[PDB]
Ligand binder design. Structure first.
Ligand SMILES: *[C@@H]1O[C@H](CO)[C@@H](O[C@@H]2O[C@H](CO)[C@@H](O)[C@H](O)[C@H]2NC(C)=O)[C@H](O)[C@H]1NC(C)=O
Ligand SMILES: *[C@@H]1O[C@H](CO)[C@@H](O[C@@H]2O[C@H](CO)[C@@H](O)[C@H](O)[C@H]2NC(C)=O)[C@H](O)[C@H]1NC(C)=O
Ligand SMILES: *[C@@H]1O[C@H](CO)[C@@H](O[C@@H]2O[C@H](CO)[C@@H](O)[C@H](O)[C@H]2NC(C)=O)[C@H](O)[C@H]1NC(C)=O
Ligand SMILES: *[C@@H]1O[C@H](CO)[C@@H](O[C@@H]2O[C@H](CO)[C@@H](O)[C@H](O)[C@H]2NC(C)=O)[C@H](O)[C@H]1NC(C)=O
Ligand SMILES: *[C@@H]1O[C@H](CO)[C@@H](O[C@@H]2O[C@H](CO)[C@@H](O)[C@H](O)[C@H]2NC(C)=O)[C@H](O)[C@H]1NC(C)=O
Ligand SMILES: *[C@@H]1O[C@H](CO)[C@@H](O[C@@H]2O[C@H](CO)[C@@H](O)[C@H](O)[C@H]2NC(C)=O)[C@H](O)[C@H]1NC(C)=O
Ligand SMILES: *[C@@H]1O[C@H](CO)[C@@H](O)[C@H](O)[C@H]1NC(C)=O
Lengths: 50, 50, 170, 98, 50
């Protein structure tokens, strides 16, 4: 039944890891959108008059 | 003293008080312990990986 | 999950391949971060340098140009910005580009836009005195270039005042 | 007109082509080359008046002086048709006699 | 295999002066590609079968 105990630990920790990974993916998508905006602004307003 | 772990043991300059047994920093991470025979402020550091 | 335990590893082995996808997602995130930085900063092909003598018609750019005395080769405002803002199986990977290279790109961009105008964004940079570049820019916004050539001193003075105020506010 | 949106350089036109799950754009752009050094000046003082170019810039190969369009070398003789007058030649920094 | 430090690119000092300009005399016409995805495959999945 120790193996049952480790089963409980495993499922809990794996669920926590999955939630963390999903949050990371969402935040990275947001950051990528902001980076695209920054690159467009830098190309259009620094290398030429907008 | 029945507490099992793995790491590298180094002399530590932490200032305990005569009634503690083992200190820590955060998130239930044991950092320094006191050997029953000598009563020395040791230190625990995880073995390197990557 | 296991923390160096054989039994936990054996029990986790029968949960299928969940960890490969987990590692693959984080690797994609890291590669995306590197691509983001590279595509937002690496905009030019060569590294430009400002001339040793700096007489830009009265405009003063000393606050933004890099200072060779500092080892970081960063400007005043960059230093202010950098100063103002502050293991159980997890690791942190260093960025592909160090800060010195980012500073070098910024300096190259600034020198190119301060000497050759907007010409360096299309082909080869062509030199142009700074006053008659601001003349072109006023012509672009809808004001005849007579205004700049008649109020150059006032324009430069109030530009310097604005940059000083922005430095103080930051 | 927005710079570097589609193609590096001044944009002329584009052509689309299909792909299995996307599109391919062919951008046609204009890029200058074979530049030459010249000596410039912001305005021209004449009869005590200041002359500015309607559209172009003043250059000279050593003498003469000419007006030219910005993106292509095509000198022309300076005339009252392509220049306009505003004020006397006493305040501009860089005024030249001609 | 050789490991080195990145080269950010070429290096040049543009010739700036307060009474000198550079004007082009000839031109070239260039054609460049750009590829953009717009769609992906449509899939459907049933529970009781899966
Ligand atoms: C451009 O602005 C800078 C502001 O930092 C000027 O540098 C100051 O100049 C004054 C006058 O000599 C000195 O008292 C300060 O100590 C200087 N500050 C620093 C940080 O060096 C600079 O002189 C200005 N440029 C010109 C051409 O006047
Ligand atoms: C600058 O260009 C002008 C125009 O081409 C040159 O003037 C001509 O020079 C040729 C060569 O001697 C003469 O045959 C023409 O009669 C000139 N045209 C005039 C005077 O209207 C001028 O020589 C050039 N200067 C330099 C220094 O290259
Ligand atoms: C371009 O810069 C040069 C060098 O700074 C200026 O030449 C100076 O002109 C003044 C005014 O006649 C003289 O008193 C100086 O002796 C000149 N310096 C040298 C080194 O010869 C020139 O006037 C500037 N041209 C502009 C601002 O249109
Ligand atoms: C451009 O021409 C004007 C008029 O010929 C020059 O103005 C004269 O300059 C001389 C010498 O400096 C003075 O003695 C006269 O008093 C000036 N006359 C007037 C009405 O101002 C002017 O110097 C010339 N510019 C250059 C750069 O030589
Ligand atoms: C335009 O004039 C400059 C001034 O002599 C010519 O020389 C160049 O000057 C820059 C900056 O001092 C150097 O980086 C170049 O290496 C120089 N070119 C040489 C030595 O061949 C310049 O060649 C002339 N032409 C152009 C297109 O700039
Ligand atoms: C502008 O550039 C074009 C192409 O770079 C030049 O045409 C070339 O001229 C040389 C010399 O006669 C020939 O060997 C090439 O075969 C030509 N190329 C083509 C595609 O025709 C043209 O002469 C240049 N014009 C100017 C004024 O510089
Ligand atoms: C335990 O015994 C050893 C050997 O006699 C001695 O060196 C040590 O000081 C003792 N420790 C305590 C806490 O009495």
């Amino acid at each position: 039944e120790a193996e049952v105990q480790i089963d409980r630990l495993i499922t809990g920790r794996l669920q926590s890891l999955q939630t963390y990974v999903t949050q990371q993916l969402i935040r990275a998508a947001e950051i990528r959108a902001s980076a695209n905006l920054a690159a467009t602004k830098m190309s259009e307003c620094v290398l030429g008059q907008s | 003293n029945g507490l099992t772990g793995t790491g590298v043991l180094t002399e530590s300059n932490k200032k305990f008080l005569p009634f503690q047994q083992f200190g820590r920093d955060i998130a239930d991470t044991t950092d320094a312990v006191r050997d029953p025979q000598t009563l020395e402020i040791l230190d625990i550091t995880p073995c390197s990986f990557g | 999950i296991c923390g160096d335990s054989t039994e936990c590893s054996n029990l986790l082995l029968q949960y299928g391949s969940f960890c490969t996808q987990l590692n693959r997602a984080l690797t994609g995130i890291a590669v995306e971060q590197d691509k983001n930085t590279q595509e937002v900063f690496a905009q030019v092909k060569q590294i430009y340098k400002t001339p040793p003598i700096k007489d830009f018609g009265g405009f003063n750019f000393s606050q933004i140009l890099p200072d060779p005395s500092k080892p970081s080769k960063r400007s005043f405002i960059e230093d202010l910005l950098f100063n103002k803002v502050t293991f159980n199986g997890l690791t942190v990977l260093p960025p592909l580009l160090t800060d010195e290279m980012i500073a070098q790109y910024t300096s190259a961009l600034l020198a190119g836009t301060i000497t050759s105008g907007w010409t360096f964004g299309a082909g080869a940079a062509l030199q142009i005195p700074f006053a008659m570049q601001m003349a072109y820019r006023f012509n672009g916004i809808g004001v005849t270039q007579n205004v700049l050539y008649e109020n150059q001193k006032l324009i430069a003075n109030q530009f310097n005042s604005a940059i000083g105020k922005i430095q103080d506010s930051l | 007109k927005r710079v570097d949106f589609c193609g590096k350089g001044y944009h002329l036109m584009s052509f689309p082509q299909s792909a299995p799950h996307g599109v391919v754009f062919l951008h046609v752009t204009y890029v200058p080359a074979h530049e030459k050094n010249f000596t410039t000046a912001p305005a021209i003082c004449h009869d005590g008046k200041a002359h500015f170019p309607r559209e172009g810039v003043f250059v000279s190969n050593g003498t003469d002086w000419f007006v030219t369009q910005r993106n292509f070398y095509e000198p022309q003789i300076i005339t009252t048709d392509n220049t306009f007058v505003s004020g006397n030649c006493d305040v501009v920094i860089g005024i030249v006699n001609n | 295999i050789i490991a080195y430090t990145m080269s950010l690119g070429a290096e040049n000092s543009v010739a700036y002066s307060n009474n000198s300009i550079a004007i082009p005399t000839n031109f070239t016409i260039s054609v460049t590609t750009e590829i953009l995805p717009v769609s992906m495959t449509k899939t459907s999945v049933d529970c009781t079968m899966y």
